């Protein structure tokens, strides 16, 4: 049981116990008054300051106000600034500060605290694991890697450090090397290893190298509640939405959008071809490591429900056409983009991040033979001027072995069963 009272705090343990009792009884405002009282009378007390912070934390929870929680984050810092802080209290205070900073999305502030924590407690392996997460959350995987390498150099069977090292390795396309770390880390059962991300990426890594045990892990990930199914492995889901790999226009209810796309398809094609000829740079190579081989680039008009105005200069009539359909232009979990794929291209089996969107494919330039897309267990072909619709949260795969290029138009839509407030509130992806 942690030691939180320095020498002077024990002399006033009565008052501090009484203030804490008010907080644990739920009488939150009484408790802040008591702790602010103690903070004034004993301005150097770490426990009184910690109490003020905790009560501000509880109060933000009750009020659900980021407002209040930002205050608690500064008080947690005030605690560490005081003299003669017990080590247990110093660690509790700065950890909760980092955690709440992450809860608010202040990832660079959380990282700063984590770095401080590691310097103060250099033998705590758990804090270096937490520091690696802080790096990953800001997209600094280089430093995250070194952190977990050091953790493994001292405690080489740390499961948490294993999965996160494997995750980093896999993201850098070191697929074979990633597998033992991800696998051994999931099997350790350590806290923080039962996470869908690691099942998702171990299975994918195994699929890429031909290891047939991959669905062994998709199975277990489904049993442990990370995947809705073994075929649909998205991780940012609204549970309950109808799940099937392929849809018809009527099944989605977006029949006006589909009609508009198919009736005006030559216009959409021509503006894409014009960009290919006179503005090649607007097409950007796919940068998610989804290709085994080949050339594949996309020209994006909407992403996260935001129109790219420079991009729409190149497809002005197409953008004007789409503005009439908020079900796609307001889909903050999807994109609207041209997609070109050239012969000799194979896209790995992969899954999208969310089940909250459906993906439409309008055929623009489709060679007679060589192009096909599998989703789940049904494989289909594109047609010039016709729309395919599939739920890309299911595993899907694509080939291109024609003798010329293949151009399609991709239009993501909210899953139809999502409510207007869900569509307005769910975080963008």
């Amino acid at each position: 049981k942690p030691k939180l009272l320095n020498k002077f705090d024990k002399t006033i343990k009565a008052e501090l116990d009484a203030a804490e009792k008010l907080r644990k009884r739920g009488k939150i405002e009484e408790a802040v008054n008591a702790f602010k009282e103690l903070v004034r009378k004993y301005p150097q007390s770490p426990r009184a300051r910690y109490g003020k912070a905790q009560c501000e934390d509880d109060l933000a929870e009750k009020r659900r106000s980021n407002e209040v929680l930002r205050g608690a984050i500064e008080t947690y810092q005030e605690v560490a600034s005081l003299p003669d802080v017990p080590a247990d209290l110093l660690k509790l205070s700065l950890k909760r500060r980092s955690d709440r900073q992450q809860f608010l999305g202040h990832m660079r502030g959380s990282l700063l605290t984590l770095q401080r924590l590691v310097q103060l407690f250099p033998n705590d392996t758990s804090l270096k694991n937490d520091l690696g997460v802080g790096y990953l959350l800001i997209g600094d995987n280089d430093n995250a890697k070194k952190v977990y390498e050091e953790v493994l150099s001292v405690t080489p069977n740390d499961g948490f450090a294993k999965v996160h090292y494997g995750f980093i390795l896999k993201a850098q396309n070191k697929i074979a090397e990633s597998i033992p770390y991800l696998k051994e880390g999931i099997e350790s059962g350590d806290p923080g290893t039962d996470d869908g991300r690691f099942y998702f990426h171990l299975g994918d890594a195994m699929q890429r190298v031909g290891n047939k045990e991959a669905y062994k892990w998709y199975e277990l990930g489904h049993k442990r509640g990370h995947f809705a199914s073994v075929w649909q492995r998205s991780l940012y889901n609204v549970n309950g939405l109808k799940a099937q790999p392929w849809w018809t226009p009527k099944e989605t209810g977006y029949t006006e959008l589909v009609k508009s796309l198919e009736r005006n398809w030559k216009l959409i094609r021509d503006e894409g071809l014009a960009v290919m000829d006179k503005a090649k740079g607007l097409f950007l190579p796919e940068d998610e490591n989804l290709r085994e081989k080949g050339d594949w680039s996309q020209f994006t008009l909407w992403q996260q429900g935001r129109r790219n105005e420079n991009a729409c200069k190149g497809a002005p009539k197409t953008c004007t056409l789409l503005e009439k359909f908020p079900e796609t232009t307001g889909c903050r979990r999807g994109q609207i983009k041209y997609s070109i794929m050239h012969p000799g291209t194979h896209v790995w089996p992969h899954t999208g991040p969310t089940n909250c969107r459906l993906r439409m494919h309008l055929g623009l330039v489709i060679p007679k033979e060589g192009c096909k897309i599998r989703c789940a267990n049904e494989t289909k072909t594109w047609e010039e001027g016709k729309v395919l619709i599939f739920d890309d949260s299911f595993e899907h795969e694509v080939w291109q072995d024609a003798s010329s290029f293949r151009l399609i138009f991709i239009v993501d839509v909210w899953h139809p069963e999502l409510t207007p407030q869900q569509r307005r509130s769910l975080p963008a992806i």
């Binding site: 608010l104 990953l136 995750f167 993201a171 991780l235 940012y236 998610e288 996260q304």
Partner: peptide, 18 residues
């Protein structure tokens, strides 16, 4: 880095508290 077609980032969203 954003998750557009795949799930390769450690987290795909930005959090905003309550």
């Amino acid at each position: 880095g954003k998750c557009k077609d795949g799930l390769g980032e450690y987290t795909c969203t930005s959090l905003e508290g309550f």
